Amino acid sequence: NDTSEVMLLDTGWEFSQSGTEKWMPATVPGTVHQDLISHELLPNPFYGMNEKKIQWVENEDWEYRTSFIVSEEQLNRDGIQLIFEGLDTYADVYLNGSLLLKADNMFVGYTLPVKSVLRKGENHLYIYFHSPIRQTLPQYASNGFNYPADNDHHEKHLSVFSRKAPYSYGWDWGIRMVTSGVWRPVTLRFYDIATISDYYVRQLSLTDENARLSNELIVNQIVPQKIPAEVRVNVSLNGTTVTEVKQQVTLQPGINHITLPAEVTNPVRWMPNGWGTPTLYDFSAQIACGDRIVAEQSHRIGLRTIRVVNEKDKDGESFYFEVNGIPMFAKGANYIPQDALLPNVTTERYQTLFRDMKEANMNMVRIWGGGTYENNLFYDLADENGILVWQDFMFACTPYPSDPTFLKRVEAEAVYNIRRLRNHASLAMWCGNNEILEALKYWGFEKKFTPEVYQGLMHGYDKLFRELLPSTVKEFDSDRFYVHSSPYLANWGRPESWGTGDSHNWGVWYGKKPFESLDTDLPRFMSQFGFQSFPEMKTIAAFAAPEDYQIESEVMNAHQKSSIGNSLIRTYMERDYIIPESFEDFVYVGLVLQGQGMRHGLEAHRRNRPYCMGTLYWQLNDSWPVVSWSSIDYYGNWKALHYQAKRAFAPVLINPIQQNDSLSVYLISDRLDTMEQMTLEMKVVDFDGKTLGKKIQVHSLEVPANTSKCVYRAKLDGWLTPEDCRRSFLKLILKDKSGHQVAESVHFFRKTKDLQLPPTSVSYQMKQTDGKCELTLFSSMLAKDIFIETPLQGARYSDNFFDLLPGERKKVIITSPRIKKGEELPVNIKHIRETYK
Ligand SMILES: O=[N+]([O-])c1ccc(O[C@@H]2O[C@H](CO)[C@@H](O)[C@H](O)[C@@H]2F)c([N+](=O)[O-])c1
Numbered sequence: 087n088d089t090s091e092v093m094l095l096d097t098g099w100e101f102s103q104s105g106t107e108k109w110m111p112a113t114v115p116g117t118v119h120q121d122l123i124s125h126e127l128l129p130n131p132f133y134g135m136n137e138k139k140i141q142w143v144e145n146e147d148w149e150y151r152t153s154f155i156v157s158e159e160q161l162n163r164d165g166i167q168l169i170f171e172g173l174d175t176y177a178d179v180y181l182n183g184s185l186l187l188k189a190d191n192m193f194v195g196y197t198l199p200v201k202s203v204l205r206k207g208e209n210h211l212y213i214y215f216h217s218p219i220r221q222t223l224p225q226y227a228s229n230g231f232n233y234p235a236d237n238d239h240h241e242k243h244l245s246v247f248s249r250k251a252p253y254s255y256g257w258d259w260g261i262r263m264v265t266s267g268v269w270r271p272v273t274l275r276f277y278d279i280a281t282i283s284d285y286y287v288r289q290l291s292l293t294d295e296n297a298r299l300s301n302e303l304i305v306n307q308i309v310p311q312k313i314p315a316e317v318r319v320n321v322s323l324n325g326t327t328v329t330e331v332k333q334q335v336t337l338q339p340g341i342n343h344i345t346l347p348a349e350v351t352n353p354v355r356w357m358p359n360g361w362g363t364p365t366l367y368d369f370s371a372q373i374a375c376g377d378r379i380v381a382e383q384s385h386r387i388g389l390r391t392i393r394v395v396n397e398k399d400k401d402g403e404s405f406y407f408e409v410n411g412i413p414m415f416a417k418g419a420n421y422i423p424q425d426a427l428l429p430n431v432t433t434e435r436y437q438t439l440f441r442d443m444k445e446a447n448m449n450m451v452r453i454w455g456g457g458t459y460e461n462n463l464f465y466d467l468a469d470e471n472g473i474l475v476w477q478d479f480m481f482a483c484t485p486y487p488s489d490p491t492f493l494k495r496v497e498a499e500a501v502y503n504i505r506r507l508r509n510h511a512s513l514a515m516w517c518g519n520n521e522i523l524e525a526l527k528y529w530g531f532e533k534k535f536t537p538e539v540y541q542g543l544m545h546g547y548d549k550l551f552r553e554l555l556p557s558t559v560k561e562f563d564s565d566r567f568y569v570h571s572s573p574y575l576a577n578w579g580r581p582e583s584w585g586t587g588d589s590h591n592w593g594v595w596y597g598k599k600p601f602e603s604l605d606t607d608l609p610r611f612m613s614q615f616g617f618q619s620f621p622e623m624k625t626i627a628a629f630a631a632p633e634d635y636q637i638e639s640e641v642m643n644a645h646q647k648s649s650i651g652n653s654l655i656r657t658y659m660e661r662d663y664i665i666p667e668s669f670e671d672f673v674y675v676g677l678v679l680q681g682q683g684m685r686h687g688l689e690a691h692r693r694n695r696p697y698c699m700g701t702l703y704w705q706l707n708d709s710w711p712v713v714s715w716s717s718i719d720y721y722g723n724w725k726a727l728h729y730q731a732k733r734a735f736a737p738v739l740i741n742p743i744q745q746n747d748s749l750s751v752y753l754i755s756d757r758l759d760t761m762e763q764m765t766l767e768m769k770v771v772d773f774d775g776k777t778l779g780k781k782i783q784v785h786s787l788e789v790p791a792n793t794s795k796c797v798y799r800a801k802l803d804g805w806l807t808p809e810d811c812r813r814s815f816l817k818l819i820l821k822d823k824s825g826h827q828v829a830e831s832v833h834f835f836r837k838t839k840d841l842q843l844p845p846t847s848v849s850y851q852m853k854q855t856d857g858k859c860e861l862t863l864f865s866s867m868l869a870k871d872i873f874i875e876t877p878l879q880g881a882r883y884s885d886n887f888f889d890l891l892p893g894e895r896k897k898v899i900i901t902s903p904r905i906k907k908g909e910e911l912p913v914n915i916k917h918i919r920e921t922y923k
Pocket residue numbers: 237257258259456482483520521592596704715
């Protein structure tokens with residue numbers, strides 16, 4: 087690495103409610119809430135009705151302090167920097183009597199020269215965190231109107247004034263925990279001569295024959311002299327040097343601008359998940375002065391082109407991603423913060439989340455603008471998992487101020503996070519905000535303000551999202567796409583805009599439209615659509631006592647932030663299922679419903695390629711125990727929707743789709759290679775296992791790369807009787823020439839509430855060892871949408887929420903480090919027919 091010494095200021099911290107003079111131990115990085123929780127000074131914020139009880143914290147100011155030693159030799163180093171990667175939010179930072187910083191942007195990292203304020207021996211760091219409420223009450227009082235941020239759960243919508251995670255003020259799947267604190271690491275660096283303040287590896291061009299890079303460095307020298315040095319870039323792959331370049335320089339005190347070209351011939355491209363390996367080079371830049379490496383910095387670098395094509399075309403305006411020259415149908419989801427308390431999210435939780443996306447066959451995630459610019463670990467994981475990232479700037483669902491001061495603050499976050507993130511292979515585009523132009527045009531805001539205020543809001547929209555933010559992107563990340571908003575034009579209520587750019591089709595849910603509307607109401611790229619579900623009972627039990635197990639109990643409503651959500655789920659459930667009586671049965675069928683309905687959408691979007699070029703459902707994940715649109719609950723349990731997403735995103739999908747009493751079958755592929763001389767084979771099977779008719783075979787089919795194509799159509803009438811349809815399913819398999827199976831599907835001709843489901847019994851044998859449970863499942867009769875339920879949080883299943891077919895044995899593997907030999911894991915197996923008598 088280099089001759090610098092880094093000291094982690096991560097222990098010895100204490101905190102205090104300002105005004106009390108009482109100091110208690112603190113954890114940094116961390117938050118006021120966690121620190122309080124860890125001394126039992128707050129109840130569990132996620133439990134029961136506790137949300138109301140923790141609100142008092144946002145009205146107090148909080149102080150934090152620590153002390154640390156600096157030695158004589160440490161004090162003699164040339165430079166000493168103090169780095170705050172995150173302060174949330176209005177924080178005055180004091181060191182040995184000196185005010186170093188009045189911080190006012192959660193999303194900005196601060197690097198402070200501190201050599202002249204440091205002392206031999208003991209040093210004292212104090213940080214005063216003004217309440218971001220108290221701090222903004224006068225600002226709001228001067229404003230003369232309330233911004234219409236309904237997700238800000240307070241009479242006064244103060245979120246919009248602070249550069250601070252929007253969701254912390256509340257959201258419609260969120261708890262309001264307006265927290266403060268040192269939310270990312272604090273480090274102190276003791277170094278010689280200079281630091282590298284920025285290292286940008288800029289791809290000038292990429293062909294199969296050659297990668298042309300420009301290594302741009304900003305080096306800040308802290309000593310007065312003219313310093314001869316040698317700048318060195320080593321490019322290596324898997325530990326072996328690929329190319330090495332050098333440059334003699336003489337460094338001047340202060341800032342220096344150095345550029346070295348580097349070329350990799352016959353580069354190995356980074357490819358996204360499902361297209362091959364996410365290959366990552368190592369680039370290390372070094373500043374050498376004689377024998378010492380005084381500063382080194384490295385990046386992992388993926389060589390690839392990404393181009394968002396947004397052009398007028400026959401169908402409206404396209405919106406798709408072209409990766410290393412090939413149009414890539416995008417498959418993934420909208421990501422929210424994983425916790426009400428950000429520093430509580432662990433390295434392992436990040437790691438598991440990327441595993442969840444990778445195993446569901448996703449190749450994209452959108453970091454939605456109500457959360458944060460994610461940490462370095464998140465983008466590193468997207469890099470090495472081949473997951474493309476759409477990064478919103480942090481504006482959502484409301485217009486925002488656009489005064490000169492507010493814009494300067496935004497500019498500093500825009501530049502800070504662009505430079506932090508621009509070397510990530512995963513980083514695919516920037517989006518100015520979520521839904522704000524939609525809000526301004528369609529959400530009935532004009533009726534809420536005077537014409538003068540509203541016009542000032544429209545002009546204010548332009549200065550931020552059409553001027554400041556695109557300008558910053560153009561300046562600091564000139565090869566990446568920027569768009570002002572998502573969706574940029576299309577509105578789900580306006581059929582004529584559907585062919586223009588991306589869509590948030592909230593016609594399902596908000597517009598109450600049936601899932602089948604997804605087959606007809608098509609976008610050029612679905613950047614959001616979603617449906618709510620209650621999480622499973624083990625997650626319900628984490629916030630509710632069994633006495634509260636009612637849809638409309640007070641504790642249950644405390645965990646449903648959509649006021650129409652419960653009835654809407656019931657309205658949709660009646661359309662496809664028999665609504666059961668017990669709460670447990672409802673929750674289970676609520677899971678099946680969300681998974682089945684959303685998957686039909688994902689299918690439609692893939693099937694309808696190239697007119698549609700992507701689908702990102704709302705939402706991946708949860709920040710706490712709550713009813714939401716997620717596919718994975720707060721504890722990391724996959725909902726049915728996550729398994730269904732995996733299936734619907736499989737690189738090769740057989741997609742039977744039934745409309746107007748007729749069945750077509752499409753074969754859908756995101757493989758880069760064409761498959762030839764394939765056979766689709768299908769057979770109707772009743773609920774006892776008995777074939778009806780013989781095998782239908784379709785031979786000599788080609789499945790071309792990156793396409794969706796009809797290969798079969800047949801009417802239902804004369805093909806099968808109305809009664810058959812209620813008592814049988816269609817099995818589909820796709821095999822190569824030799825007869826090797828590459829894909830499988832099952833089709834039902836009727837809605838589940840109309841199937842004549844047999845009362846049946848699912849038996850299983852279990853072999854349990856340390857960390858693993860291996861079940862073999864049996865039912866002589868079809869068992870519909872089965873849910874293998876265990877009480878163990880975060881338990882992972884090879885599969886779940888699948889139909890168990892008559893007489894067909896099924897092996898399911900469950901893993902968890904909590905599983906121990908000689909300790910029967912409890913299993914409860916539910917299926918549709920059991921939910922009614
Ligand atoms: O028509 N609407 O009132 C509507 C539609 C969508 C919407 O937000 C999207 O949907 C999700 C579910 O409502 C939100 O949680 C998230 O903000 C996302 F951007 C929001 N919203 O969060 O204000 C409102």
